Symmetry: none
Subunit: 201 residues, 4 copies
């Protein structure tokens, strides 16, 4: 598809701000996150059957709404549980996303799919062009311990993620740098959408 523009981001707030802006300028946005969530609610009753032997704490919260707090404990506690939920959810997530992305490509106006950087349900780099809002960060262990004031284990944790973020840029189509002030980052999203808006991208 041709009007498909994923928007993902090294920091979660970049993701959303660009989405706030594209919206006002008369463009439409799908939220991969809202979709995934929607999935868990529509299959409540099968989810309870599948996951209930894993706990005594009931999975259904009310009238066919799934207890997410409980489900996330179950998968965190239980590697079998974790693989079953993954495989149960991937096809459904993939399928819904891909459904709505054909609803709008045909509508022939550029559209944006807002999606977390390491979202699992497929390899979406095929479907459209990817926009990654990247904030480059220090990859030095010591400087993060001193900066954000952390133990080694927590700095390890933070550093491994920033290193894994930078790798993902090899998969991007458009990178918007986000190293300067809020209002300044803002205009750059504005500029980009415009270029998309006249077939320049």
């Amino acid at each position: 598809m041709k009007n498909a523009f994923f928007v993902t981001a090294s920091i979660a707030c970049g993701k959303s701000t660009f989405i706030e802006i594209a919206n006002s300028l008369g463009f439409k946005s799908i939220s991969a996150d809202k979709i995934a969530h929607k999935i868990l609610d529509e299959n409540a009753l099968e989810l309870e059957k599948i996951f209930s032997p894993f706990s005594l704490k009931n999975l259904l919260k009310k009238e066919k709404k799934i207890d997410r707090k409980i489900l996330g404990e179950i998968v965190f506690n239980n590697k079998e549980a974790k693989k079953i939920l993954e495989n149960f959810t991937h096809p459904k997530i993939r399928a819904k996303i891909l459904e709505q992305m054909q609803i709008l490509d045909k509508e022939n106006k550029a559209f944006f799919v807002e999606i977390p950087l390491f979202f699992e349900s497929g390899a979406y780099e095929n479907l459209g062009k990817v926009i990654v809002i990247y904030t480059p960060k220090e990859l030095s262990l010591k400087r993060i311990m001193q900066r954000d004031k952390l133990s080694l284990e927590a700095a390890k944790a933070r550093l491994d993620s920033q290193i894994d973020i930078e790798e993902k840029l090899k998969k991007a189509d458009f990178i918007i740098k986000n190293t300067n002030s809020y209002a300044d980052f803002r205009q750059e999203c504005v500029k980009v959408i415009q270029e998309i808006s006249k077939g320049n991208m």
Copy 2:
């Protein structure tokens, strides 16, 4: 080995917990991997807020610096990197905590029971056993599951069968609950004389 340590594994969840509750009610101490993990997350709540606050636009602390396990589960759900980053931070701490806790209890010269993490030469083994045709087809059609989901479940079933081999005690989690309950006490009684 480690003298008084007993690991409990069950085919179904509610077997385990029935055993461990009964053992508790008869004065025996137990360690819960799930509960260890839970305290680890609160014990590290602030660290986690900084590691994981760029992933979401929601506050990861709920009130009085405790961690929101709803939100952490959301940030983690369907995210390869957040799963990995959390696992790698927490799993080490969980392992150590367990081992630390095993050693203490062992020094009290009374049998105690460790619920094996679902994230052993070290002690003796009790498996709470519920027979099952170890069959991918049965699992798929009974439980209504895909191919790879069923294999996850099947591999857990095979893991228990493996343990049946050198189990020091096997407790059949039969169709009669009340029976199975008294199958537990007799084991615990036999454990207590040694």
Copy 3:
């Protein structure tokens, strides 16, 4: 992207090599993924010695800028860090050399076959061309594997898991050649498909 490219992969090794023996005889070009892979280790023999020598007291280099593949495999089997480095070292080199030799034969405008191990690593090759899986169905029953194949629980588990994974991989094949019956019958089928391809009919 390439029209003349066919991946040949198999649920068991002889399935793949027979379809290739027959494809060659019928005059079509094949490249081997594992051969290309093996040659990457030798072309980068000096750099690998530097990177991996700190994991062993032994020598990686066997003779004249050649890699002792026995030792290197012991290193990566014994060391998680070595394994990841090797994977990241080789993957892009394998990927560009495979994609080097497939753009040669695609413009050469005759059908060709990339022999490849079913779970090969160095990229997602499904998007480059068409995938031919030679499949031999199996009973996904633990107990029937211990009997027939005379194995312990543990080894049966391994065998069963791999079979399950194999079936998973078909969800991404374009063309599945069954392989349940005799040798002879399997060979005929290869020829029927290679022909159907030969006409550009497939």
Copy 4:
């Protein structure tokens, strides 16, 4: 739990082997993860050929029904599935033998050294330390590695650094070999009485 168990881990491989050699010459036994694994492979050669014969046209067994470890690396190299199957089958048996062995030597009431597997609240920790500017940038240029490769290396470096915190013996891997050796012997004498 095991009073006599000492775990050795080093920043570079040769620090670890020097120290173990010196400890072996002074009469202290040692457990090699790498050797245990080696023995598991030969122990299970028959089953391994049956698991792995569908991956390769080659013979996986040598004369004297020994495993062919060249051929098994060829089948596993760049094959995600063969790796997983091999790791899943062997790793448990390796871990069990490590502990089975640890427990036997600890009954001899003599200090012994466990070479930590590179594929620890059960004993004491000896870290054989070679300081390093724990920087990804330095690792990529000093070692000629890409982003993810240097990451794997860096991560290993941080794991050594995590164990500096509570280690019982830290031995600097100086720039003199000779003295580093002397650093080893004092430690081992230190350990020999207490």
